[PDB]
Design a protein around this motif. Structure first.
Motif, PDB file in Angstrom:
ATOM      1  N   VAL A  64       7.862  -8.879   3.689  1.00 17.70           N
ATOM      2  CA  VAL A  64       6.813  -7.877   3.838  1.00 17.70           C
ATOM      3  C   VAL A  64       6.371  -7.336   2.485  1.00 17.70           C
ATOM      4  O   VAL A  64       7.200  -6.987   1.644  1.00 17.70           O
ATOM      5  CB  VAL A  64       7.308  -6.712   4.716  1.00 17.70           C
ATOM      6  CG1 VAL A  64       6.232  -5.643   4.839  1.00 17.70           C
ATOM      7  CG2 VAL A  64       7.710  -7.232   6.088  1.00 17.70           C
ATOM      8  N   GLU A  65       5.060  -7.269   2.280  1.00 18.49           N
ATOM      9  CA  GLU A  65       4.504  -6.736   1.042  1.00 18.49           C
ATOM     10  C   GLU A  65       4.226  -5.243   1.160  1.00 18.49           C
ATOM     11  O   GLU A  65       3.813  -4.761   2.215  1.00 18.49           O
ATOM     12  CB  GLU A  65       3.218  -7.478   0.671  1.00 18.49           C
ATOM     13  CG  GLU A  65       3.408  -8.960   0.383  1.00 18.49           C
ATOM     14  CD  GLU A  65       2.123  -9.657   0.029  1.00 18.49           C
ATOM     15  OE1 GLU A  65       1.097  -9.019   0.053  1.00 18.49           O
ATOM     16  OE2 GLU A  65       2.167 -10.827  -0.265  1.00 18.49           O
ATOM     17  N   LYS A  66       4.452  -4.516   0.072  1.00 19.33           N
ATOM     18  CA  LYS A  66       4.184  -3.083   0.038  1.00 19.33           C
ATOM     19  C   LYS A  66       3.265  -2.721  -1.122  1.00 19.33           C
ATOM     20  O   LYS A  66       3.623  -2.895  -2.287  1.00 19.33           O
ATOM     21  CB  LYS A  66       5.491  -2.296  -0.062  1.00 19.33           C
ATOM     22  CG  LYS A  66       5.315  -0.783  -0.070  1.00 19.33           C
ATOM     23  CD  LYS A  66       6.657  -0.071  -0.159  1.00 19.33           C
ATOM     24  CE  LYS A  66       6.481   1.440  -0.210  1.00 19.33           C
ATOM     25  NZ  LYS A  66       7.785   2.148  -0.313  1.00 19.33           N
ATOM     26  N   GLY A  67       2.080  -2.217  -0.797  1.00 13.13           N
ATOM     27  CA  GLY A  67       1.083  -1.887  -1.809  1.00 13.13           C
ATOM     28  C   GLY A  67       1.587  -0.794  -2.742  1.00 13.13           C
ATOM     29  O   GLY A  67       2.262   0.141  -2.311  1.00 13.13           O
ATOM     30  N   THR A  68       1.257  -0.918  -4.023  1.00 13.38           N
ATOM     31  CA  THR A  68       1.680   0.057  -5.021  1.00 13.38           C
ATOM     32  C   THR A  68       0.689   0.130  -6.175  1.00 13.38           C
ATOM     33  O   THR A  68      -0.405  -0.429  -6.102  1.00 13.38           O
ATOM     34  CB  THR A  68       3.082  -0.278  -5.563  1.00 13.38           C
ATOM     35  OG1 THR A  68       3.556   0.807  -6.372  1.00 13.38           O
ATOM     36  CG2 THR A  68       3.041  -1.548  -6.400  1.00 13.38           C
ATOM     37  N   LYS A  69       1.078   0.822  -7.239  1.00  7.97           N
ATOM     38  CA  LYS A  69       0.211   0.996  -8.400  1.00  7.97           C
ATOM     39  C   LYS A  69       0.959   0.710  -9.695  1.00  7.97           C
ATOM     40  O   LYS A  69       1.309   1.627 -10.437  1.00  7.97           O
ATOM     41  CB  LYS A  69      -0.368   2.411  -8.428  1.00  7.97           C
ATOM     42  CG  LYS A  69      -1.295   2.736  -7.265  1.00  7.97           C
ATOM     43  CD  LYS A  69      -1.812   4.164  -7.351  1.00  7.97           C
ATOM     44  CE  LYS A  69      -2.768   4.478  -6.209  1.00  7.97           C
ATOM     45  NZ  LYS A  69      -3.207   5.899  -6.227  1.00  7.97           N
ATOM     46  N   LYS A  70       1.204  -0.570  -9.961  1.00  5.17           N
ATOM     47  CA  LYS A  70       1.935  -0.977 -11.155  1.00  5.17           C
ATOM     48  C   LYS A  70       1.171  -2.041 -11.932  1.00  5.17           C
ATOM     49  O   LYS A  70       0.266  -1.724 -12.654  1.00  5.17           O
ATOM     50  CB  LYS A  70       3.324  -1.495 -10.781  1.00  5.17           C
ATOM     51  CG  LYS A  70       4.248  -0.443 -10.180  1.00  5.17           C
ATOM     52  CD  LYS A  70       5.630  -1.014  -9.904  1.00  5.17           C
ATOM     53  CE  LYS A  70       6.571   0.050  -9.358  1.00  5.17           C
ATOM     54  NZ  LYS A  70       7.927  -0.496  -9.078  1.00  5.17           N
TER      55      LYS A  70
END
Length: 84
Positions: free
Chosen positions: A78-84
């Protein structure tokens, strides 16, 4: 020593064992923070073992494997959206 008329039997049986799978969650900067997106669907596998049971005079003698086949499991990703 079974006390009866000799008779040769060949009882075949199929063994099916479900295979567990692993789970992993990874981050995806390309997705908006908090976004959940399944990359790989979690599915169980199966190990198949087909055997033949040799019996004589209603008396088990020995066994021999006819054929085997293993289906690989599908780990869930499962992918989890982030800000990197």
């Amino acid at each position: 020593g079974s006390h009866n008329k000799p008779e040769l039997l060949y009882r075949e049986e199929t063994i099916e064992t479900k295979i567990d799978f692993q789970e992993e969650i990874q981050e995806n900067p390309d997705l908006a923070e908090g976004t959940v997106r399944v990359k790989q669907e979690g599915k169980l596998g199966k190990k198949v073992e087909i055997v033949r049971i040799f019996s004589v005079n209603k008396e088990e003698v020995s066994r021999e494997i006819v054929s085997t086949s293993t289906t690989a499991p599908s780990p869930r990703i499962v992918e989890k959206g982030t800000k990197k």
